[PDB]
Structure 1
Amino acid sequence: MRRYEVNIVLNPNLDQSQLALEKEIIQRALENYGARVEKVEELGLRRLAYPIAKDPQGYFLWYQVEMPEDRVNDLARELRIRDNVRRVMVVKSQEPFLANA
């Protein structure tokens, strides 16, 4: 088991109802891969530096989890399958290295 920071970015122009629907798939899949969650953050829509999928905006997420390091790749595969998912990105969790402290 290892700690990760699963980012996800979704289509902003979708309704808030289907937004919940895609969020549902995120959860089930998460569980199917034993991705027991933790401190989650959902910063909503934000300003994109470049049009991702012809769309100037995008809905953001961000998690933190423990799960078998083996099925972490398989997971990212399962996430991207949705059309309204624009940018999955798992990352190794890392203690805050800081400067100017």
Structure 2
Amino acid sequence: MRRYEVNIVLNPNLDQSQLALEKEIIQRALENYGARVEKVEELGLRRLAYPIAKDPQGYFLWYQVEMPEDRVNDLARELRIRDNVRRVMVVKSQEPF
């Protein structure tokens, strides 16, 4: 069990009930892959380093989790098949909250 930071970029044009739904799917994918969610931050819109789906902005979500390292790559895969997930990046936690 290792602590990771999961950085999710979502489609910037979702309304609030679409946004809450994507968040619920992300939490169930987290729980189903063995993750203990310790911190969630809703960061909001930011301009991307390069456009994704011809969109130069994205809605950012960050999570601090503790999960089995052998499951991380399958979780990142699962999260990437939702059409509204523009980018997933999981890094090892260096300075945990």
* TM-score of the superposed pair, with normalisation by structure 2: 0.91
Show the 5 A alignment for 1:1-101.
Answer: 1-95=1-95
Deviations 1:3-55 (A, max 9, x none): 10000000011212111111110000100011101122111111223322101
Q: Distance in 2 between matches of 1:95 and 1:20?
A: 28
Q: Which has more radius of gyration?
A: 1
- The Cα RMSD (Å) is 2.0
Gaps of 5+ in 1: none
Q: Which one is further off, 74-83 or 46-55?
A: 46-55
Q: Distance in 2 between matches of 1:28 and 1:35?
A: 10
Identity %: 100
Gaps of 5+ in 2: none
**1:96 CA displacement:** 8.6
* TM-score of the superposed pair, with normalisation by structure 1: 0.88
Q: Secondary structure at 2:28's aligned position in 1?
A: helix
> Number of matched residues?
97
